[PDB]
Design an enzyme around this catalytic site. Structure first.
Site, PDB file in Angstrom:
ATOM      1  N   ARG A  44       0.807  -1.213   0.000  1.00  0.00           N
ATOM      2  CA  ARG A  44       0.000   0.000   0.000  1.00  0.00           C
ATOM      3  C   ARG A  44       0.843   1.268   0.000  1.00  0.00           C
ATOM      4  O   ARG A  44       0.312   2.349  -0.278  1.00  0.00           O
ATOM      5  CB  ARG A  44      -0.939   0.008   1.209  1.00  0.00           C
TER       6      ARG A  44
HETATM    7  N1  LIG Z   1      -6.529   3.582  -9.939  1.00  0.00           N
HETATM    8  C1  LIG Z   1      -5.665   2.675  -9.425  1.00  0.00           C
HETATM    9  N2  LIG Z   1      -4.579   2.270 -10.120  1.00  0.00           N
HETATM   10  C2  LIG Z   1      -3.713   1.369  -9.621  1.00  0.00           C
HETATM   11  N3  LIG Z   1      -3.845   0.799  -8.409  1.00  0.00           N
HETATM   12  C3  LIG Z   1      -4.888   1.112  -7.604  1.00  0.00           C
HETATM   13  C4  LIG Z   1      -5.879   2.091  -8.079  1.00  0.00           C
HETATM   14  N4  LIG Z   1      -6.794   2.217  -7.101  1.00  0.00           N
HETATM   15  C5  LIG Z   1      -6.424   1.393  -6.088  1.00  0.00           C
HETATM   16  N5  LIG Z   1      -5.288   0.734  -6.387  1.00  0.00           N
HETATM   17  C6  LIG Z   1      -4.598  -0.246  -5.511  1.00  0.00           C
HETATM   18  O1  LIG Z   1      -5.532  -0.855  -4.617  1.00  0.00           O
HETATM   19  C7  LIG Z   1      -4.957  -0.994  -3.316  1.00  0.00           C
HETATM   20  C8  LIG Z   1      -5.999  -0.710  -2.241  1.00  0.00           C
HETATM   21  O2  LIG Z   1      -5.415  -0.891  -0.954  1.00  0.00           O
HETATM   22  P1  LIG Z   1      -6.255  -0.649   0.401  1.00  0.00           P
HETATM   23  O3  LIG Z   1      -6.892   0.719   0.353  1.00  0.00           O
HETATM   24  O4  LIG Z   1      -5.353  -0.998   1.560  1.00  0.00           O
HETATM   25  O5  LIG Z   1      -7.421  -1.760   0.346  1.00  0.00           O
HETATM   26  P2  LIG Z   1      -8.963  -1.362   0.092  1.00  0.00           P
HETATM   27  O6  LIG Z   1      -8.962  -0.602  -1.211  1.00  0.00           O
HETATM   28  O7  LIG Z   1      -9.671  -2.694   0.030  1.00  0.00           O
HETATM   29  O8  LIG Z   1      -9.322  -0.526   1.298  1.00  0.00           O
HETATM   30  C9  LIG Z   1      -3.789  -0.023  -3.238  1.00  0.00           C
HETATM   31  O9  LIG Z   1      -2.622  -0.696  -2.756  1.00  0.00           O
HETATM   32  C10 LIG Z   1      -3.561   0.464  -4.655  1.00  0.00           C
HETATM   33  O10 LIG Z   1      -2.243   0.115  -5.089  1.00  0.00           O
END
Ligand SMILES: Nc1ncnc2c1ncn2[C@@H]1O[C@H](COP(=O)(O)OP(=O)(O)O)[C@@H](O)[C@H]1O
Ligand SMILES: Nc1ncnc2c1ncn2[C@@H]1O[C@H](COP(=O)(O)OP(=O)(O)OP(=O)(O)O)[C@@H](O)[C@H]1O
Ligand SMILES: Nc1ncnc2c1ncn2[C@@H]1O[C@H](COP(=O)(O)OP(=O)(O)O)[C@@H](O)[C@H]1O
Ligand SMILES: [Mg+2]
Ligand SMILES: [Mg+2]
Lengths: 506, 471, 163, 353, 102
Positions: free
Chosen positions: E69
């Site tokens: 993250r």
């Molecule tokens: N537009 C995007 N492009 C690339 N990766 C994304 C995008 N949106 C979210 N992510 C990935 O999704 C992950 C969400 O992590 P987290 O917030 O901890 O879990 P959740 O979204 O289930 O709460 C992030 O590590 C991020 O790298």
């Protein structure tokens, strides 16, 4: 080992004197309040399922009458009740208002008006927990319930007095079929025939506050809220109000069937009513069963659905329809609450989420939905075209896998694929666009005979509006005779074939 | 003064039974103060009453250090929180105290967290669309103005990144004030959200702010997590009723409110429900979702995020919240592994504003045509895994190529996800997204490749990416 | 009137309920000798114990047996109402718990309790506990005290932890 | 008469307090006067002690106060037996629900009775002639056993029960007893009108099949006791008159679900798949009574319903152990040109040796 | 217990605490009760599959399942320049490896 009632505070009262208060029958003292449950000490003269009243103004229903205490379920918030409050008894059972004065206003679970249109002229008072009809005061389902949909009036045709379930997943066609059937009764309720009208009874249980206001505003703009009862029961109230919403709405709709009129109840939804009954039973110190439900899980839904039946000629000639919507999880029709409602009802309308995204409006599976009444509760004019369409739709579904290889089709395989695709696209209707019995009989006869096989698949939407508009100005005598008589003679079959052949050349 | 002093008789975890006098006992949902050893206090909300001059209270903090027989004074009312314009820009807690080290909140009034919802006669229906900026939100499930929005999804699908990207392009240009109330979040997500709003102009420490911050992650106990939703909604309800402004409540996550009540339901004397939940799951979720609606005094666009348990939409905390939301943005874990940013489901997401009378006849045909092509590609893909591409004809071959390019065109690079993607953020309008989807479905972009539409904007960015990749 | 002695809340509230009505017109002195006669004539008797501990009899049969035995013993005031409440509610099996909790109320509000070492202490009925424990510990350590430990066990545990 | 007072009323379970010596035993019907109803039946389940015994009401307990008069009948739930119950719609308490007057019966037998002993049973398995060509050759029905009628809607389940009752009364001289436990409200009215137009139930002539009403609109006590009321009338014709009676329980899955509802609300723990703990004891007490004695036999033709198409469940495997024959009605024929849709390969029986 | 291990600011001393919690699964089932609760509280997870660990690829770290993250902010500038497309090359090589068996 230990018990409640007399404990510390309540135990230090009978030692000094065995009298104190001369009541101990019509009143009671609250000893423990919480989670919408009040343990009132006393009230020996209170009957089962009787209404109560607290000192702050909140009402209650004594359902767990113990030997020392009395478990009453509060209909409001638990912040108004405290330890030591006086709880009086009303002396009557849980009843609600009924009559012809409730049409045009949105009532709650106890009969109070919430639309803000003054009082309601109630002609009677009926109890919520009422008995269903017997086997001697019931007749056969002969009247036809016009829903407006072309795929509901031909396949699983529902009648007056039956119970048609509305199973389905999330956003697949659950509340859409119930709203179109109540709005399609404007052609019979605006006239003078009292036996042809059907008063709707939408019972919104478990929905939010924004969903109940949007459904009432759409029915008033199309002149459909003047003869339709609205039972408002949101999820923001107590568990006693949402669980008793099915019994209160069935008592108000039973006054029309017992007088000589017809009714139609729509319990939306059946899944929300089962969660409200299990919440009040888990807080009353009771044993649970399967899926965290009580022992009377199957008897709670079968008792409210058996009261909507068709009476005989000696009772008045009325009937009542029950349209319960079963909100399934992920398309599994063999669950805990889904299997109990399908086995007690005489038919179920399945709604899949895969057919709604393809173009079928609404998504109604013909291979999964069926009616127990059959063709006995339908019109004679529509039964002649639905008999040949049922065999063609069943044969095209089993041979639908050969549509991807159109270069290896035979003579009988190409005829079933062309006729099956035009019949399924012709029954697809838009939202809030119900059709009558005369307009649906002319569209089903052109696809079953072979007058729509020469047209293309993309021109099926334009051919439904062009054939209906030309039949109302050129051959108006054929459409009016099919609705008044309700059947088709030898002269009506020859006139319908000549008009469809002349209009198919352009 | 007549202070209702109480004695602590039982203390097992978050629940603490306080014994008071006869007649002077407090009511339900009442804040009970307790003097500790530090300069703060121990807030305790009365849940139920066991009887015999005793009521079970739920502590909103750490219950360590409480002995049998301590003084427990009653405040007389519920959990008061600071409302008005003074709460904008400050980090408030569940009890209404500041946690930003910026002095006390100078508020003239203090409303309670426990309040009744609106009636049926005070509801105001609407059918207005709200532009977010994404190509998959402005074409499939459109968000309604003043309604409840739910971003369903699993762990690591994109639930936290979806709420942060929408607040940087809709809440920063709105006329009303925002209300970011995080319940059950993380410790690192609270510090990163406050620093991003100060550099963009949403929270000014020396000027004016239009965003209320309500702390309350999973670092506290079960009492503070369940009361974090009621404390954050009290400040946003005062700006839409007393002031009359279009407030925007941002809850992250919405699934933590139902899971917090089930953690203390076993110690309160209640039987467990299904999947280890509480019996009053539909009663506690409906009392908080009905109060965040749109009345005649003002609107309230709630953009909460629902967290699916291990990617399961048939749970008791995910299926009960789908009936109290207009637009549902359900996310799938399978589309996030293929490269779609974000993983927006084009068939599982539904909304009430996706009709021909709200968006028009031109926008209704584009939404129905894109959903029919995506649903037909799932049935044709199963035959290619056993028979191959030889069974497809001329119409089946063109539908497979058009479905792959339409799925990658809806994924746009967000502005908050620039550290993980690398490319810059693009924002497409509502008129540009409907014109680009209608031209690709007719046969105007059939000669272009599938890589020109992946991670692009509208129709202008797809034509520039195809010419640069061929050189 | 509720005295600060707690004494459970459900089972211990049997003797505390009758203490409120017996604390009027000086009726607490006669209740101590009348409660001991009901337990001594049922335990070491082997007659009315087996005929009352069973789950038979009835409501009128249990009340008539308590009124016949109290007319020839030592009960005429409020002692007859204590046995009638335990007969209808099926509480005659635990008659020793109601008589033991009644004697603890007179010894707490008019005397000391607790302990100290070896056997019992003195349990004086003065006022404070600091001025009564210091004047009774010096007079009890000299007279008697057979001493048949605490300081020798604490010294041996400290040497083993440092080795 | 032994009188009692109501002490508790929590739904279907109602506790009554009697006196000393006049306490009722288990499986005892308790009378209770109501308003519009005649008498509220309440079968005694167990005794909690202290002159109190918990009972289960067989009707609606709404309107009962704490301290109502509860009279004891002295025996179990008696029902009318003999030739007077033919053509009338009886209930679980032995009362008429057809509005055709009271059943003038000479005697009343209780619903709770023991089955036959090992010395009074049949030493050889005899075949029962039904009259059909696909039943007497393939899966033959045993004299005094259970037969499962599996089939869908519109296959020929109602026509097969009416043709088998008329053929047995003309070739062997045996009556029938239709006990529709757990049926619907619309299915009970359609079955009584169809039997009168075919000649099975005659109001002015002579009837040959008993009607036992048992819808699911009542409480859990009436649905569970519906199987014992219908089996008591069919067993009297084989012990007193000596005739091969045929009992019909539509459906068989409703009897197992009704027994677990009253047991879970009393305080008993559940078993597998949310079933009751005494699954093999409740199903074996009613299946052993329909056997062959020295004076007559009692065939059973119940309709077994599989739960979610699973034959290895607790309600399907427990009822299949006592079924000697099986009448599977698949949907392959019907419209193919077979009357009725009788599967010659799926319908098996243990008497085809 | 995992929320206390966070990086402090410059006014608190400038220290940090790293938390490495290991989750013992049963047959690779990450959709359990204790498995899904710890994965939704931490900032990323390292999935250790048992299929690639027996073949010799130690350590078996799935590139398509394990993610961070923090992103590229918690890495050095020297490793991020030479391996800027390391996350995109793992997804492209996985789809091309299955085409050799067809
Ligand atoms: N537009 C995007 N492009 C690339 N990766 C994304 C995008 N949106 C979210 N992510 C990935 O999704 C992950 C969400 O992590 P987290 O917030 O901890 O879990 P959740 O979204 O289930 O709460 C992030 O590590 C991020 O790298
Ligand atoms: N036949 C149809 N054609 C076009 N749109 C439809 C049709 N049926 C339903 N819809 C759309 O589906 C949406 C929801 O319909 P409906 O109210 O019947 O289900 P719902 O109650 O929202 O389902 P849930 O309770 O699961 O959310 C409506 O906004 C409507 O536009
Ligand atoms: N011997 C037969 N010959 C022709 N048709 C029959 C025969 N037996 C039954 N049927 C048909 O089977 C249908 C059964 O209908 P119904 O009783 O409503 O369903 P079910 O048999 O499943 O209860 C009847 O409509 C009848 O026409
Ligand atoms: Mg609905
Ligand atoms: Mg998140």
């Amino acid at each position: 080992k230990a018990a409640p009632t007399e404990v510390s505070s309540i135990l230090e009262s009978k030692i000094r004197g065995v009298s104190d208060e001369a009541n101990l029958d019509e009143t009671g003292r609250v000893l423990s309040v919480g989670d919408g449950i009040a343990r009132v000490f006393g009230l020996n003269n209170c009957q089962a399922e009787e209404l109560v009243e607290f000192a702050s103004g909140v009402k209650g229903m004594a359902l767990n009458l113990e030997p020392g205490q009395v478990g009453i379920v509060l209909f409001g918030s638990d912040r108004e009740v405290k330890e030591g409050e006086i709880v009086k008894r009303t002396g009557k059972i849980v009843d609600v208002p009924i009559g012809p004065g409730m049409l045009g206003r949105v009532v709650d679970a106890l009969g109070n008006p919430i639309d803000g249109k003054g009082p309601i002229e109630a002609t009677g008072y009926a109890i919520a927990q009422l008995k269903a009809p017997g086997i001697l005061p019931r007749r056969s389902v002969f009247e036809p319930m016009q829903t407006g949909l072309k795929a509901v009036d031909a396949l699983v045709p529902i009648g007056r007095g039956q119970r048609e379930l509305i199973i389905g997943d999330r956003q697949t066609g659950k509340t859409a079929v119930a709203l179109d059937t109540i709005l399609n009764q404007k052609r019979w309720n605006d006239g003078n025939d009292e036996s042809k009208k059907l008063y709707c009874v939408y019972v919104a249980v478990g929905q939010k506050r924004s969903t109940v206001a949007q459904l009432v505003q759409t029915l008033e703009q199309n002149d459909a809220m003047k003869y339709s009862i609205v039972v408002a029961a949101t999820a923001s109230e107590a568990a006693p109000l949402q669980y008793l919403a099915p019994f209160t709405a069935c008592a108000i709709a039973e006054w029309f069937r017992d007088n000589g009129k017809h009714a139609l109840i729509v319990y939306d939804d059946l899944s929300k009513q089962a969660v409200a009954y299990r919440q009040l039973s888990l807080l009353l110190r009771r044993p649970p069963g399967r899926e965290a439900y009580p022992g009377d899980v199957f008897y709670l839904h079968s008792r409210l659905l058996e009261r909507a039946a068709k009476m005989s000629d000696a009772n008045g000639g009325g009937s009542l329809t029950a349209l319960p919507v079963i909100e399934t999880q992920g398309g599994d029709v063999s669950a805990y609450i889904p299997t109990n409602v399908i086995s007690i009802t005489d038919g179920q309308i399945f709604l899949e989420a895969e057919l709604f995204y393809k173009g079928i409006r609404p998504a109604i599976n013909v291979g999964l939905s069926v009616s127990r009444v059959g063709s006995a509760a339908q019109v004679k004019a529509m039964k002649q075209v639905a008999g040949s369409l049922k065999l063609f739709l069943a044969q095209y579904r089993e041979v639908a896998a050969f549509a991807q290889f159109g270069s290896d089709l035979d003579a009988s395989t190409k005829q079933t694929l062309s006729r099956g695709e035009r019949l399924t696209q012709l029954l697809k209707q838009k939202q809030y666009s119900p059709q009558a019995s005369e307009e649906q009989v002319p569209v089903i006869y052109a696809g079953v005979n072979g007058f729509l096989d020469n047209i293309p698949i993309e021109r099926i939407p334009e051919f439904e509006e062009q054939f209906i508009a030309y039949l109302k100005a050129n051959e108006g005598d054929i459409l009016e005779a099919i609705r008044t008589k309700g059947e088709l003679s030898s002269e009506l079959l020859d006139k319908l074939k000549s008009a469809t052949e002349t209009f198919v050349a352009t | 003064a007549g202070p209702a002093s109480g004695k602590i008789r039982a203390v097992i975890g978050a629940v603490v039974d306080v014994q008071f006098e006869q007649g002077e006992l407090p009511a339900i949902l009442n804040a009970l103060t307790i003097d500790q050893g530090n300069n703060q206090k121990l807030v305790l909300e009365v849940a139920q009453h066991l009887g015999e001059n005793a009521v079970r209270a739920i502590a909103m903090d750490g219950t360590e250090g409480l002995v049998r027989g301590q003084t427990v004074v009653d405040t007389g009312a519920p959990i008061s929180v600071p409302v008005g314009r003074g709460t904008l820009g400050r980090i408030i807690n569940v009890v209404g105290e500041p946690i930003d080290e910026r002095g006390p909140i100078e508020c003239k009034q203090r409303n309670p967290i426990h309040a009744d919802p609106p009636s049926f006669v005070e509801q105001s229906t609407e059918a207005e669309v709200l532009e977010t900026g994404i190509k998959v939100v402005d074409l499939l499930a459109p968000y309604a103005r003043g309604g409840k929005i739910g971003l369903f999804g699993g762990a690591g699908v994109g639930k936290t990144v979806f709420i942060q990207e929408l607040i940087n392009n809709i809440a920063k240009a709105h006329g009303g004030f925002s209300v970011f109330t995080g319940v059950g979040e993380r410790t690192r997500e609270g510090n990163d959200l406050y620093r991003e709003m100060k550099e963009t102009g949403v929270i000014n420490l020396e000027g004016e702010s239009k965003v209320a911050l309500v702390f309350g992650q999973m670092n506290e106990p079960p009492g503070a997590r369940a009361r974090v939703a009621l404390t954050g909604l009290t400040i946003a309800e005062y700006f839409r009723d007393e002031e009359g402004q279009d407030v925007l409540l941002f809850v992250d996550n919405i699934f933590r409110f139902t899971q917090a009540g089930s953690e203390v339901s076993a110690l309160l004397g209640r039987i467990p429900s299904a999947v280890g939940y509480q019996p009053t799951l539909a009663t506690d979720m409906g009392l908080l979702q009905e109060r965040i609606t749109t009345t005649r005094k003002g609107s309230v666009t709630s953009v909460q995020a629902v967290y699916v348990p291990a990617d399961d939409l048939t749970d008791p905390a995910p299926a009960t919240t789908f009936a109290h939301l207009d637009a549902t943005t359900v996310l799938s874990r399978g589309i996030s592994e293929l490269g779609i940013y974000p993983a927006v489901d084009p068939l599982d997401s539904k909304s009430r504003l996706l009709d021909v009378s709200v968006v028009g006849q031109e926008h209704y045909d584009v939404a129905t045509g894109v959903q029919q092509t995506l649903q037909a590609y799932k049935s044709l893909q199963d035959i290619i895994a056993i028979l191959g591409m030889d069974e497809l004809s001329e119409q089946d071959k063109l539908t497979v190529e058009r479905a792959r390019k339409i799925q990658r065109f809806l994924s746009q690079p967000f502005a908050v996800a620039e550290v993980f993607t690398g490319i810059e953020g693009k924002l497409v309008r509502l008129k540009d997204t409907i014109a680009s989807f209608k031209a690709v479905l007719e046969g105007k972009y059939d000669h272009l490749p599938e890589n020109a539409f992946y991670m692009v904007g509208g129709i202008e960015d797809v034509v520039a990416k195809a010419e640069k990749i061929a050189a | 009137i509720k005295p600060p002695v707690q004494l459970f809340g459900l089972d211990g509230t049997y003797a505390t309920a009758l203490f409120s009505a017996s604390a009027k017109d000086s009726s607490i002195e006669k209740t101590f000798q009348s409660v001991q006669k009901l337990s001594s004539t049922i335990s070491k008797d082997a007659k009315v114990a087996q005929v009352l501990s069973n789950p038979a009899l009835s409501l009128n049969s249990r009340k008539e047996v308590v009124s016949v035995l109290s007319k020839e013993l030592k009960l005429e005031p409020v002692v007859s109402n204590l046995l009638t409440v335990l007969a209808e509610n099926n509480r005659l099996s635990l008659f020793d718990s109601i008589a033991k909790q009644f004697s603890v109320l007179n010894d707490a509000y008019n005397g000391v309790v607790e302990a100290t070492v070896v056997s019992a202490k003195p349990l004086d009925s003065k006022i404070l506990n600091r001025l009564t424990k210091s004047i009774t510990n010096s007079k009890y350590v000299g007279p008697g005290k057979t001493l048949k430990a605490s300081k020798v066990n604490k010294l041996n545990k400290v040497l083993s932890e440092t080795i």
